[PDB]
Amino acid sequence: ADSCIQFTRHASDVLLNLNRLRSRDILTDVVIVVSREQFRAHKTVLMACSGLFYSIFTDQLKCNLSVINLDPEINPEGFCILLDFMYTSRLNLREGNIMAVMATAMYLQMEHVVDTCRKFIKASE
Template identity: 35%
Template sequence: MEPSPLSPSGAALPLPLSLAPPPLPLPAAAVVHVSFPEVTSALLESLNQQRLQGQLCDVSIRVQGREFRAHRAVLAASSPYFHDQVLLKGMTSISLPSVMDPGAFETVLASAYTGRLSMAAADIVNFLTVGSVLQMWHIVDKCTELLRE
């Protein structure tokens, strides 16, 4: 086999593909693990865009007369309440208690897709209510912490 050419600095240059030695075959029992961390955020971003455009949404949620569309898989994964409604009861249309603020719900729904939640300090109790009803304990915990400060 021909030695690798050297660059002006003396470092070996990569051989052209046709001159490179063939890769060693992996043993049949070998397990190769590959991770694509950007896929998770790209997937949720794509689902959120679909939600915003009303595409492929398969659940309607009503809050004080306002209707919100979402993906049942995202709802079930983000909220034990929605998990029970869409998976155990098979519901595709859900009416939430009138005690819930529609604006706070809309923001919490978006947070299920984005992992981010922004709220005015004056609205923390509204978000605490939404988190409590939907059994989204991470929101309940954060709102409780903010109210104690």
């Protein structure tokens, strides 16, 4: 219908609550392994934020896996920063992590993050 009203804060409130479920380990259904580190998450949130996870979890075999191992070249802190961005909209971008964050965002197919990393790098050169 074209007659709907909208609650402005709803999408933000949903994301806050999904991150609270992740913090409490409620209904997490996948572990992402990045070298020596493991991160528990919800497949639907990963798919909704990343083109790589969208492809993985729509594959008829990989959709059923409970563990996904990422490429060993992926930096765990870079992944942690991007997973926190997925669940909060906030990206902890710092001089010390920007190259790892950008490389991880390219691998995860997160173009908006890649774009801001490129802009911050270009401003310092």
